[PDB]
């Protein structure tokens, strides 16, 4: 049985691995990025940070840009290509590019959309392509625990109640490790809702605990004490409650603005504030840095959490832009090993840590790590639990 | 060893029983309402609570309105008087606490005072200074009405807003009398403790606010709310609890505590805090618009309480819906089924406590929560209840 994964990002690569670790399945990764295809076929993970990166070193797997080769004789196709939101613009052109290829080569491949889409998208795209063999099943994995989250999903959501739905459902149950998983079958608009609203809840919770931290900072109260006290209510819980410079990453900022596009022309809403509180928190962090009046500022890591490959839409890049807007006279210096060029966004990169720590008045880091501990004293961070 | 509990309410009564079960404590409830004092003295729980009734069943406490009698030789006083947010003047009302501290200061200024009533952030620090008493400790209450004593015996955690040995005495006093084994207890300064309470309630209001906005969206687009909410809640970071949509969040405390924190969020262009309050009012007006779209001629209100277990409807969201209905379309004839109401009318609305006549009289029934009785009439019943948690 042949499975095509379209897109070698975090979602596609984790799903490719999930389906390939059992000898019965032939898995093919399809992309337009020949760098990604060339990496895979050299048994290197293009996504530099993979928890279970033991998979590549110790189940076979094949990548190609060849539409013909991939979809030829394929039973399922998983669409894991980018979807963005740009303004109100719902960018799904990668999905329509794949579906157009799929409808050309062969149309009866059972298509699973994993990329996050607008509510009502899947029902619309089936009508407009004249294809009923398309099922939306959202993806809930975290970057940098992608394959773990794929083997042990929180739950499986199948946006189809027909027999095509149960078909897609059994395909995932028979390949995940997690057992007695919650699996919910529902119509497609409901599944798309589950995804946008789930991410919007998580954004809201981060926004909540950062408003707590902001409040504590303005009145010079102990944040850890307050958050620990709040979180001991089991209805609130001791997790996912560590203040930061703000929520970011690839999806939460996009998906919250998505849902807010649906929530226009009502006077206010949690959905609007979930977006707006994040920008206020980032500007407040910036104001706090300015008040320390540094002359040379070191940005420690462009990533947000320390188990992260990338800084795509990292909050700390937003902090850089706010610093540049409110006081371009503050010289900024980045310590970020992942960047090989020595200017990122016109800011000097200094990947000698000793030179970086000595050069700067003040270091801002979203999260502490042991490498920062030596110079703890010049470090500004909202990190409370050191997660 | 002698503990005075001030306020015979949900918090006071629960704490008073919490301490009197232990027969080495002498426990006195002190109140201004002679009706509630009478009831207590007649071994009569003036409220309803499963474990509270069982305690009164099993076997103790005494009540009075004489402050000299209560406070004489008291080691501890627990203040459980009402704190209100009053919309006029945008302020939280703490007079009751100050009236009680004045009595304490004049009769026995050295009683160890424990404030359980919810107060503004910074209150206890300022009130210790204003009365010149450092023997005052804030310790928030987290009980839910109708599980008040279970939550007292088995509290999620203890928060003591004083890091000195007096606070250690207060925390240790609660450890002794609770039955929850190996409970989380946090010592912290008083502002942080006041912050914990207001923010914890604000989070809960936020969560109800969130799942109602989900329900609102789903209704606007004819989607299945139960599907959507179950799929959301299956994420263990979100959780399968405290997520049942409704006409809006209500009760004594959530509506006042969120508005108080919002006041203490001075001049912020937007915030979760402000939205948490505003979304509740939008949800309520949306519920009302939905009811009116059904163009009922005679509308039945099933219960004024928020939930079956409750036996009170102070700040019940049902009543806000009633008031919006009266404002948006005064032509609909409203009828209330509420056995807790003994008078012929409430808010000038006919009360019909014969369930037979009520169900036949009306074209459509609104109920915040389904119960046993309504399944028989389910087809003219409008509710946002998704899980029938009753
Ligand atoms: N990043 C996450 O943690 C996460 C989690 C859940 C859902 N999602 C959703 O999945 C989508 C993909 O996430 P990602 O971060 O793994 O993507 P990504 O940006 O890391 O990579 C997507 C891949 O798709 C390739 N591609 C682009 N257009 C293509 C086309 N027409 N045909 C074939 N391949 C094409 C790209 O070359 C790229 O390699 C997100 O946009 C979002 O909708 C992401
Ligand atoms: N009700 C809850 O679920 C809950 C939970 C946690 C905290 N709290 C906090 O506890 C406070 C009280 O809650 P409640 O439900 O018990 O309120 P309640 O109104 O039912 O209890 C008030 C009692 O205190 C009496 N009282 C008023 N003034 C007094 C005075 N000067 N001296 C002595 N007694 C006086 C009143 O006569 C009344 O009997 C709330 O305002 C809230 O701040 C409530
Ligand atoms: O305690 C916390 C936890 C998270 N964050 C920030 O919130 C953002 C989201 O973090 P996280 O949810 O841990 O990782 P993501 O890779 O962004 O995954 C989220 O976004 C994915 C994209 O859809 C979803 O599939 C995941 O379930 C969802 O967790 C990040 O900026 C975090 O740094 C905090 O500030 N404090
Ligand atoms: O899934 C849910 C849960 C609650 N609510 C509503 O939210 C309000 C408050 O509900 P609940 O918290 O269950 O009862 P309370 O007795 O008001 O207790 C709250 O208010 C007290 C603050 O004083 C705290 O001590 C408690 O921890 C806190 O739960 C009520 O209107 C509920 O009907 C919903 O609509 N859906």
Swiss-Prot record, chain B:
Pfam families per record: UDPG_MGDP_dh, UDPG_MGDP_dh_C, UDPG_MGDP_dh_N
Entry keywords, A to Z: Capsule biogenesis/degradation, NAD, Oxidoreductase
A molecular-function term among this protein's GO annotations: protein homodimerization activity
SMART domains: UDPG_MGDP_dh_C
Active site: 253 (nucleophile)
Binding site for NAD(+): 11, 31, 36, 83, 118, 145, 252, 256, 314
Annotated metabolic or biological route of this protein: Nucleotide-sugar biosynthesis; UDP-alpha-D-glucuronate biosynthesis; UDP-alpha-D-glucuronate from UDP-alpha-D-glucose: step 1/1; Capsule biogenesis; capsule polysaccharide biosynthesis
EC number: 1.1.1.22
Catalytic activity from the UniProt record: UDP-alpha-D-glucose + 2 NAD(+) + H2O = UDP-alpha-D-glucuronate + 2 NADH + 3 H(+)
Binding positions (substrate): 141-145, 197, 201, 242-246, 250, 307
InterPro entries, per the entry: 6-PGluconate_DH-like_C_sf, 6PGD_dom2, NAD(P)-bd_dom_sf, UDP-Glc/GDP-Man, UDP-Glc/GDP-Man_DH_C, UDP-Glc/GDP-Man_DH_C_sf, UDP-Glc/GDP-Man_DH_dimer, UDP-Glc/GDP-Man_DH_N
NCBIfam families (alphabetical): NDP-sugDHase
Function: Catalyzes the formation of UDP-glucuronic acid which is required for capsular polysaccharide synthesis. Does not catalyze the formation of glucuronamide moiety of the capsular polysaccharide.
Family indicated by similarity: Belongs to the UDP-glucose/GDP-mannose dehydrogenase family.
Subunit note: Homodimer.
Record's protein name: UDP-glucose 6-dehydrogenase
Organism name: Campylobacter jejuni subsp. jejuni serotype O:2 (strain ATCC 700819 / NCTC 11168)
